[PDB]
RNA sequence: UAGACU
């Protein structure tokens, strides 16, 4: 047994057996990260097991470090810097980090793999679960999957440590002069989920000129701003869903529009990726966002203010295909190509081994993602055409309609050899051109400068 | 979009 604070002294030996996948479905706030994880790790070390701990985001990574402080753990994430004598037997990294490692060889032969937030719909995370479950099935490892919302979750309002008041109200997606007093009149601390940084900035600036102390959180502001949510006093946290999971704010209210943009592979005509939306989030995401509050048993009157219903069907989301794209090029030390984790199979109808790439194309694929910063789909389309990483011709030889326009003007690229060409890529992926910043990156790619 | 890494 254990008290609420400390981790349990007793750990089930069942979970360490090779060929065993433990699924830990426990409601948000049940101490899964802060209690259960240290228990496993402690028992991992005494058992002397080569151990992998996986966190979806730097936010979760950081909440893990607090709970594991003082244990001989190797942190391979910019979120945590700590002293390490390279003889550790426990590694901790992010889901996407592990996957890209798998694609780039040779990875420690882990006896034990702990995947926290094992519902994460990120194509790399899905791909990781395929590898992990395949390692378990070969009797090469034991694994634990931890998540409050395991695949098949439908309940947007799970149980909490404290009563939650669920309120449906219209929520502004931009600035507002009037009409939304309840936002600013509320005396406590608010966590507000936003689908984008630009939207986040608009709302943040809006709240500031109302006298409110606002910290903005996103992939770009994490390092300097996250510690501020912990040790400092503030009124609002405006956040992208970098904070969707694991985050521990001392908050009283979540504001959740439950909307976001979604990459979708279109197969009506020539195949391409658009950014569909804004569309409702899945029940799992909503439950995670609501799960940020009602965590404190001492504090009984927390609130979750939301707009609209979730949408479970995300089968048109590109991540199911992209995961298969990644997984089809991941191999086990024995030579087996992994199969998707059970509950996530047949999310799209892809042939067995349809995305396998041979020799040099695989190299290029990986390089297009890691060096090129290109989405999985685009990276795959280019690589599988037999184009090498540095050959940017495909950025200019697309059909007439693939002409990229910015500010209603045809985008011109000045190449590394002084040539002027129109940005007209053979494959369209709205992720490299929709946001102005993303387009600049892609302009640099087309230039020959990435 | 969002995340992850160098």
UniProtKB/Swiss-Prot annotation:
Provide the membrane-side ranges marked Cytoplasmic in the record: 5-450
Catalytic activity, as annotated: Selective hydrolysis of -Xaa-Xaa-|-Yaa- bonds in which each of the Xaa can be either Arg or Lys and Yaa can be either Ser or Ala
Intervals of motif DEAH box: 116-119
Top-level lineage group: Viruses
Record region (Important for RNA-binding)? 17-20
Q: Where in the cell is it found?
A: Host endoplasmic reticulum membrane
Segments forming domain Helicase C-terminal: 178-345
How is this chain modified after translation?
Answer: Acetylated by host KAT5. Acetylation modulates NS3 RNA-binding and unwinding activities and plays an important positive role for viral replication.
The residues that the entry says bind ATP are 26-33
- Site note Involved in NS3 ATPase and RTPase activities applies to 289, 292
Q: Where is the Helicase ATP-binding domain?
A: 13-168
Q: How does it sit in the membrane?
A: Peripheral membrane protein
User: N6-acetyllysine is carried by which residues?
Assistant: 220
State what this protein does: Displays three enzymatic activities: serine protease, NTPase and RNA helicase. NS3 serine protease, in association with NS2B, performs its autocleavage and cleaves the polyprotein at dibasic sites in the cytoplasm: C-prM, NS2A-NS2B, NS2B-NS3, NS3-NS4A, NS4A-2K and NS4B-NS5. NS3 RNA helicase binds RNA and unwinds dsRNA in the 3' to 5' direction.
What is known about its subunit structure? Forms a heterodimer with NS2B. Interacts with NS4B. Interacts with unphosphorylated RNA-directed RNA polymerase NS5; this interaction stimulates RNA-directed RNA polymerase NS5 guanylyltransferase activity. Interacts with host SHFL.
Record protein name field? Serine protease NS3
Origin species: Dengue virus type 4 (strain Thailand/0348/1991)
Top-down, what is the taxonomic lineage of the species of origin? Answer: Viruses, Riboviria, Orthornavirae, Kitrinoviricota, Flasuviricetes
């Amino acid at each position: 047994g254990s008290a609420m604070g400390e981790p349990d002294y007793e750990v089930d030996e069942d979970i360490f057996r090779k060929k065993r996948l433990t699924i830990m479905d426990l409601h948000p706030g049940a101490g899964k990260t802060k209690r259960i994880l240290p228990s496993i790790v402690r028992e991992a070390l005494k058992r002397r097991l080569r151990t992998l701990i996986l966190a979806p985001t730097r936010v979760v990574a950081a909440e893990m470090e607090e709970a594991l402080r003082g244990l001989p753990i190797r942190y391979q994430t910019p979120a945590v810097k700590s002293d390490h004598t390279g003889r550790e037997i426990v590694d901790l990294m992010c889901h996407a980090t592990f996957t890209t490692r798998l694609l780039s060889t040779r990875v420690p032969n882990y006896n034990l793999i702990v995947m926290d937030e094992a519902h994460f719909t990120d194509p790399c995370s899905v791909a990781a679960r395929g590898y992990i479950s395949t390692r378990v099935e070969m009797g090469e490892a034991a694994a634990i999957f931890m998540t409050a919302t395991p695949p098949g979750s439908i309940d947007p309002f799970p149980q909490s440590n404290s009563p939650i008041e669920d309120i449906e109200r219209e929520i502004p997606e931009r600035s507002w002069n009037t009409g939304f007093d309840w936002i600013t009149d509320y005396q406590g601390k608010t966590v507000w989920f936003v689908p984008s940084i630009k939207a986040g900035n608009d709302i943040a600036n809006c709240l500031r000129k109302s006298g409110k102390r606002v910290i903005q959180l996103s992939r770009k502001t994490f390092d300097t701003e996250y510690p501020k949510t912990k040790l400092t006093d503030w009124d609002f946290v405006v956040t992208t869903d970098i904070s969707e999971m694991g985050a521990n704010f001392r908050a009283g209210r979540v504001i959740d529009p439950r909307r976001c943009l979604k990459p979708v592979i279109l197969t009506d005509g020539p195949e391409r990726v658009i950014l569909a939306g804004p569309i409702p989030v899945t029940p799992a995401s909503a439950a995670q966002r609501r799960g940020r509050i009602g965590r404190n048993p001492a504090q009984e009157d927390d609130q979750y203010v939301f707009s609209g219903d979730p949408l479970k069907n995300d089968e048109d989301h590109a991540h199911w295909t992209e995961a298969k794209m990644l997984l089809d090029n991941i191999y086990t030390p024995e030579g087996i190509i992994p199969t998707l984790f059970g509950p996530e199979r047949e999310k799209t109808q892809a042939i067995d081994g349809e995305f396998r790439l041979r020799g040099e194309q695989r190299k290029t694929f990986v390089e297009l993602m890691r060096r090129g910063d290109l989405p999985v789909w685009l990276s795959y389309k280019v690589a599988s055409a037999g184009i090498s990483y540095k050959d940017r011709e495909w950025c200019f030889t697309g059909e007439r309609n693939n002409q990229i326009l910015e500010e209603n003007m045809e985008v011109e690229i000045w190449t590394r050899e002084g040539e002027k060409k129109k940005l007209r890529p053979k494959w369209l992926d709205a992720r490299v051109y929709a946001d102005p910043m993303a387009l600049k990156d892609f302009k640099e790619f087309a230039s020959g400068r990435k």
